[PDB]
Design a protein around this nucleic acid. Sequence first.
DNA 1: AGCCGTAGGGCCCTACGGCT
DNA 2: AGCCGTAGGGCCCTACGGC
Lengths: 673, 672
Amino acid sequence: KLADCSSKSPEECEIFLVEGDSAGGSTKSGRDSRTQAILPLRGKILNVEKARLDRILNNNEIRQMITAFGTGIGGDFDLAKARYHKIVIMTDADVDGAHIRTLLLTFFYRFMRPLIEAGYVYIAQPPTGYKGLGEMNADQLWETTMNPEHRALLQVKLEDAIEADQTFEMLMGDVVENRRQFIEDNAVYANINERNITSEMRESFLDYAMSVIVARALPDVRDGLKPVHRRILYGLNEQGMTPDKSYKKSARIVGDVMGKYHPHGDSSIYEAMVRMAQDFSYRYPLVDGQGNFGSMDGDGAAAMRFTEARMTKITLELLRDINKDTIDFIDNYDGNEREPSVLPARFPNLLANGASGIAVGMATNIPPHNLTELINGVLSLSKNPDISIAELMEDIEGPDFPTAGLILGKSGIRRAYETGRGSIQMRSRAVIEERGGGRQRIVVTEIPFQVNKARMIEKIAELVRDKKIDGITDLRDETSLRTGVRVVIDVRKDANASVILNNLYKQTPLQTSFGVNMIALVNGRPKLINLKEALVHYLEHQKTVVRRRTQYNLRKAKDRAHILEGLRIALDHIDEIISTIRESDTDKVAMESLQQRFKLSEKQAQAILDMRLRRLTGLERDKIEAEYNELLNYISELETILADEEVLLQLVRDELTEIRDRFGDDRRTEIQL
Amino acid sequence: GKLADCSSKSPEECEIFLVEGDSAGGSTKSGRDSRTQAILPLRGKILNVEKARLDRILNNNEIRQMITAFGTGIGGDFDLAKARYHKIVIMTDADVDGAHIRTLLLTFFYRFMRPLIEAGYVYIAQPPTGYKGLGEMNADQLWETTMNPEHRALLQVKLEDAIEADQTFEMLMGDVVENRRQFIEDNAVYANERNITSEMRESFLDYAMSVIVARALPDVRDGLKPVHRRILYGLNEQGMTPDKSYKKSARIVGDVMGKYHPHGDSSIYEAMVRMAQDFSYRYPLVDGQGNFGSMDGDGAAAMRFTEARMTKITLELLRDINKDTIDFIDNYDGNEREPSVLPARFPNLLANGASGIAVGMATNIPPHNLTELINGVLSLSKNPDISIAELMEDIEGPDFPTAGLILGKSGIRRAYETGRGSIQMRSRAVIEERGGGRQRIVVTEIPFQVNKARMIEKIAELVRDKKIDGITDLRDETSLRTGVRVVIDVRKDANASVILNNLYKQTPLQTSFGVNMIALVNGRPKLINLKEALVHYLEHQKTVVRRRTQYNLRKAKDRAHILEGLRIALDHIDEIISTIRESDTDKVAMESLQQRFKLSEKQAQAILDMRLRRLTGLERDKIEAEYNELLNYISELETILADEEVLLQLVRDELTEIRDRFGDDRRTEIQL
DNA sequence: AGCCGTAGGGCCCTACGGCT
DNA sequence: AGCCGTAGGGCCCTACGGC
Ligand SMILES: COc1ccc2nccc(CC[C@H]3OC[C@H](NC(=O)c4ccc5c(c4)NC(=O)CO5)CO3)c2c1
Ligand SMILES: [Mn+2]
Ligand SMILES: [Mn+2]
């Protein structure tokens, strides 16, 4: 990995740590290879503050850093033996780079403290607006960042130790609550110089943490999506990949999304897209995949060069009226594109499909739900702001998993909908049945959500082999496209099969809990929310969307009647119209002449100058009158909706109801007492 | 291993499907009936056992997995009794690479498991085409077509004459290239049971002709392989021109993968990267931003990091592509159109050169100076009987991006005469003082295609293993600011020149370029000499300029015809408007306009599409200005089409301009 | 040898939080 | 104790021909 310098005189020698060979290459090409060494790492380095020492000392990248510095670790640490008097951290100028920087400072503080004391550690300052240093040309990387003349390094000073120790403990240690508190306390949500090592850690760390929270791992309460899923669906949309049209190569989709909207690795995008295609993961799948999109047995999808994809019908409902000023667009990562900040989301997607995400200081875990039940819930809520969770549960019985199965008891469900937290006990659907000669078997035909069917079956085998469960004489996955899931467990003759089943439910994922933890972005801040808040924020979104959409169609039909007004004047005075144009030299004079003569606006004048001659035929004259008369009718319909809060809300209901009628379906998961 | 066995054991009723990898595997595993159907994914191309020794075969993972899985052992240890399946089913992707992996698999079974074949246990599944690999198929469909024993069509492989079979495996898959080449030349055609010899011959031949005509060899006209052509056409169709800014590498590769080139990402991205390296291409076709590699054989950044567009001179490859200069063809799936060849307004085969390993043959064509090339083609255009020797008054010999030296003219001369020759390339190295009466060797240019770091390591090896006297140190002082610089310290009092000569004998510091000018001519491979290359090249240009002139003619005559309808209309504007105003439909207006004013359908249409702003005052006059300049152009064009000396001179003229704008100095020095 | 350059194909480290 | 899902990062086997 190391690409060393010529000079062995450590006095004048620098080593640069970079994230991988992609940056490595640019760095190598632009360095001064007499004084300047380069060590590429390989992504996130190990967190030494949370890891056992066995594996701190085995980890490659840790090891190689040790070798390169040649000073040994901890007690047996000779400053005098530093092969370099400058260790320069130069990760990418993105948030994951800030995080890899915190990880490294932690390693150095806890294993090479003197190195920091001695003033040998530094932080390079590459320009922003660059995914990694691999996107820079070597000359740029040199001028800006590496050239001893016209560059700016921060030298890491350690002031108070005690404070440093607490900081590393809080930020990087395994007590989440300490970290969570710091985030809350310091996050500001939207509506050779010395650098203190504590200052750097808290600023770098918070930068990462906030970024993961608002812009990675948590879904938005309004549309139920994380950034990656939003930019995927929105890309499908901008490229017209509707279900009527045909499937397009995943690589096209991914390439496009990566380029315009999502400056991150290919596999994060493709894997997100894949899940959205899996009817064992999504209760209402958002992508329609062609090819191998993986199995319940933990199989990956085929590589993105093989598969293809489009929207499902129901994703249309997520995107409807996105170009009717329903929702605010923002700048993409680099200035050159516009992306939606949220989707219209005309059905309640946060709950329908659920969410899961590991952030920093917190996580989220929201189960999926029956859409017929959810919309009935939003209906009841719309007729009654003061409805209770108990009343809402009259409609929303509890979660509805794609994989079906059983939930045991209404009581975890109730806590989760009331507090935002609760454990939910899920079981497989298993029956006991004769197989012949007075012997029996267990048949599992549905397994709990998020359980790998293979791993589950291996577990049972590994219980039968470690002689750790009695009575089982065979185990077979008879699952098949033709017959559905079907896992068979033969039972020894005369053994009690019900007992064996209970044993499996105790000792295998045949029974599994689901720990609800309903954190989402509300005003782009993380909040633990109950069932009713989820539906309130959802309905508040829908109200705004149907209002803005109605306001937009008004401005637009008004703009258009205005033009049809110019054109009807034209048709009534066509001879004089022709005359005015013919007697004009420029287009500028005609425009002025038509405004004055016939009291037309600039826009009308221009639309008349744009009329083609074929529009003076019989049918074309009629269409202009017809389009105009239909449009006045529509304009006054729109005005009705905007002048009356109750007609608007009634529209919201009628629309929800239509979606419930077209996409609603049976409950799959049975909830038992 | 990723073996997914079935649940039954008795092999009489159990089958195993071999597929290319896990993408195919998953569709196969979700599709299959797992009571009787095992699946074993491989990993792409398997080893050719006909060309490998036994130590290597038995180290190979995929080979091992197959042996284990089948349970018969191999060779004389073979045993039909211990078969775990009575049907072994080869199910590779429905493409040419899948024919090839079929031939490799059958080569393994015939040489190590022949009784398996003698006994009827081997089979070939028949998936549908249209799908890159099985990973693009849904499991329901792969079940119906291919795997379900009530529907599928299986071929059962049969051995007849074992002597013929031996000859075939030997010829097709053995180490002797020439019999294979001969079999290709003899069988190629350019523009229930299955005999194993027929399968081998037909599957291999497919593969072979696919690599030859459509992978590894350049076209003589444009100097390009399918992958480079599709990339450049891609850049163009998305206007990624040099005036515009850079697009993202992943977008470009994604575009091209979908539209034109159904193959792995890395083949595309790597082809693009090389086109951007100024140490690889004498005249780079791609302009890249980010890490695109080094002479030390670092690869580019991954494609999420880099951006790219055309270079100035690529516009010249593409100039006039829209003027019917070249025949477009269907892409691989029917939903696109691609160029079969580029206009190529400079001679790109010899300019940037080409190297490719095919089947039965290879190509290796060095790069050249463009100022020289062009003077060459001009000279040829003044004299169809120009000799190689006269041609070499312009074209001194290869000119490499990396500069350096060529020793003597005799390899050059042989190469240009016959299309084969060996050319000795040598570093640019000087000897210089370093202080205290010591000296060093400074190397500042290295041969084409010689990895600099790997070369420095071969020098270290010699010093370490004491096969060279007198070297005390070795350093790469290469930098952006300094250019290539490799220093070799010599021991006080040792003769530096001697040392340097040893380095030339013993290191890539001197390297042969083995010229072997194979290219496609009417899409068939041909060994061509210097002159035959320039001639095909000149022929393409004349065709281009002629087809270009024919196109502008059709187009200017079409436009004149429109303008003759517009003249009539502006001159009769009222009767025109009444004619229309009186007409119920757009149809009736066309008919009336046409009867009353002697107009064609297309003249009537142009009038009906006329906007009212065209009736302003100075428009009857513009139409007339335009129309008179059109008639002038029309005849300027007819001049050209009727006199071949005028067309040829036109060709000469455009080339001279390209020479003036893009021609640069020779970099490689030719020492005699 | 083993390397040139288009082709087939796939695997494994790391962070992060909460549940087992 | 190790999985789940967005994220950071990269490597190594194969065919082909010519020297
Ligand atoms: C399969 O299993 C193995 C296992 C062993 C391996 N050892 C080392 C490295 C790897 C893979 C690392 C490599 O890095 C670059 C990756 N792709 C991109 O950067 C990229 C970005 C955007 C894109 C595309 C690609 N593809 C498009 O068509 C457009 O959108 C491709 O994968 C290995 C792979
Ligand atoms: Mn990075
Ligand atoms: Mn394949």
